[PDB]
Amino acid sequence: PFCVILPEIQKPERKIQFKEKVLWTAITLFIFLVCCQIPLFGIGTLMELGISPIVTSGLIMQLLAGAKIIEVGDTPKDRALFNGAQKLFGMIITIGQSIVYVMTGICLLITIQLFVAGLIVLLLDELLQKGYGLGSGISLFIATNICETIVWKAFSPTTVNTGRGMEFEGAIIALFHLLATRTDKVRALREAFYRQNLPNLMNLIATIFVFAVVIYFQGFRVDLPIKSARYRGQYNTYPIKLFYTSNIPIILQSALVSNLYVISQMLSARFPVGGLCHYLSPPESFGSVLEDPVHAVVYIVFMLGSCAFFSKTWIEVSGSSAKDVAKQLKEQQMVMRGHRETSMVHELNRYIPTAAAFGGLCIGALSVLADFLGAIGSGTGILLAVTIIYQYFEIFVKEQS
């Protein structure tokens, strides 16, 4: 009864040609970045909440789907009652976030416009999901990253802050202006402990370096033969990718184990910036062991462990296990080239478990390269750009073909 009330986009009357579908994205991408400035009416932008409330409710409803609290059906009816329900959770969660974003610290006017801002993107999202190759929830995570990257990398704000400088006062300080004056005498930059802080441009090439190693691991996958039933030798493949889990929920856990740990020390005072946080979170000192070795030992292993642990649990929930994939295939009538159905479980199972974890253990160490590097992205979500980048180009090739 609720799914009928809310709006959906018409499935296009026929096929659409790529020149049009590409020009639909000039529209939505123009409109998102038009939305990512204009400040709300507090006498700050329109895109304050973003798609993250819809994504996270997506994850909450996917874990309710996966934990078997609410039943999931590959049949279109149980999906037809669920695909609207998910969008409804996406509709409520942006109202919930309209309250939650404001409450922590004029109001109702602002909540209406944050609600409208979250609402508009939910449709702009579905537009791309029918009249374009790829969705949108995705697209925005590119859009609001590569811009911030190139602004913070080759825009003029070295003048102030951590971001470039190496000057004790104002002076002349733009990313390119120092590349004209550092060429004359010493760069000052070599393999050593260094003055620390300094600028960011030198970091920048590191940020390109983890970019250029991420791409390598975005290739990495295992292939399992898949010939459907009822079709002589038509060789479809199924990829188990090294990363898997898209390693999205693992870093969310990495944030959550920081959010539960750092509040429960403030809960204990009512019934420590030093002791408790001095063993958990990193030193953010450029060097390896530095002055304090114990800060360096506890931070790493625990993160790579707790990231992995959460990966291996994720799979037990959001389908993507041994047992579930099989179902998923069995539905669409697919099989291993020479096996009885059941055996599938076994023959691919020995690929999933390892992956689920080993991805995590490769992403924990990649947060470590990003933190130790102090890279310009300063995070794991450089990955996220390239994942999507790959996906987009592949469409450009599909539509080229």
């Binding site: 991408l29 990512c36 292939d223 090294l242 253990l361």
Partner: protein
């Protein structure tokens, strides 16, 4: 203690030998494709900022 790890490492050292792993023709796809996004994003993220700094108090010329 740690006995599971000597099997974890050996089990995870499999899938790397099993996996496809790229080579430059695909390495170039993803390298080229990095240039694609870059060129479309910027333009707007610079229009956005120029409207607001001279409306409150004129200090640039926009």
């Amino acid at each position: 203690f740690v006995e599971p790890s000597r099997q974890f490492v050996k089990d995870s050292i499999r899938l790397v030998k099993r996996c496809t792993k790229p080579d430059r023709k695909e390495f170039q796809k993803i390298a080229m494709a990095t240039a694609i996004g870059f060129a479309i994003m910027g333009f707007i993220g610079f229009f956005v900022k120029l409207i607001h700094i001279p409306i409150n108090n004129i200090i640039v010329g926009g």
